[PDB]
Amino acid sequence: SETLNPSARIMTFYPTMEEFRNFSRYIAYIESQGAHRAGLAKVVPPKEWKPRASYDDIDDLVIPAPIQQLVTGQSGLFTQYNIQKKAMTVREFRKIANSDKYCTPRYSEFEELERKYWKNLTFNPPIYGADVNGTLYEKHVDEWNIGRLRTILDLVEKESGITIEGVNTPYLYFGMWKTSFAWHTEDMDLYSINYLHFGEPKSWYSVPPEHGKRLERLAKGFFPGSAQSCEAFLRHKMTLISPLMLKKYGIPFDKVTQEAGEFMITFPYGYHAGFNHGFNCAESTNFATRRWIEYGKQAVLCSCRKDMVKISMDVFVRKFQPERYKLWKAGKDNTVIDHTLPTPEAAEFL
Ligand SMILES: O=C(O)c1ccnc(-c2cc[nH]n2)c1
Ligand SMILES: [Cl-]
Ligand code: NI
Ligand SMILES: [Zn+2]
What we know:
By secondary structure, the chain is α+β, with helices and mostly antiparallel strands. The chain is 23% helix and 24% strand. The protein starts with 10 loop residues before the first strand and ends in a 21-residue tail after the last helix.
């Protein structure tokens, strides 16, 4: 376990069509290769795979709650404030995104675009067509369908009827240049799948789950007010920290750029952040493996906010940890998580 991906670098996978067909099995496989150690992995689907025939019929799709992203800060430390704007179609969004005021600046290397992002982050607040309920997958697509992955996370809706928008349902994200996703782990420290349907790239930063607590200590020191009001303030998804600040305080991290037609997998307790290069569309949801259950049980949740995502772990412990159920209910389950260990389903690849 502590022998596979010892550098904990972001890994990229190129599955065959046969490998790609079984979603859960392929997650088990990439974990047997140590992909989870970085907290983030890229999966390039087979060349002949397409989730939709064309994206020429979606300009009339409504973005019910577009978000203007106001960013305040200096010296690589920032807080993002969301200003909800009026409903707009993808049509109206693509116009504003590709306009002279909001379009991508001219650049050669990614390092130049990255530098311009961290330099101009607080100027000309962009609009993010975020958290749009829906899928762009065609009903017949059975491989990696974000709308129906069929992992154990389905036990939440199957047993309780509870649907959590974007968590056990898909979300669509219409981006423009300089739109950001702040430093965070998933709700309940779950996995996530992200597919870039079309457009300009999405760049990502990732902190290995092995070093997540170090990132939290750093953030707590930089925003002591926030940390005092809520232990899990990073779950508010308002905190932006430049890679130079991470480098300066010895926090290990890696970076990757996701192109259209590529998937990104985030792993339990994997801190990630990033930005969009220009106009694009991404689809995402959360998912689980048997390895996630312990992460769900130990997840430090946001106290201070109402409507914060909290999944009852009871059904998972009863079904997959019956021998530890009574101990866990009594608050005596003292299991320590080994972030290097792959999911039990990977046993066949080890
Ligand atoms: O907006 C995005 O590009 C994006 C990327 C990575 N993660 C999330 C997220 C939001 C809630 N959970 N994960 C959103
Ligand atoms: Cl936090
Ligand atoms: Ni995320
Ligand atoms: Zn909070």
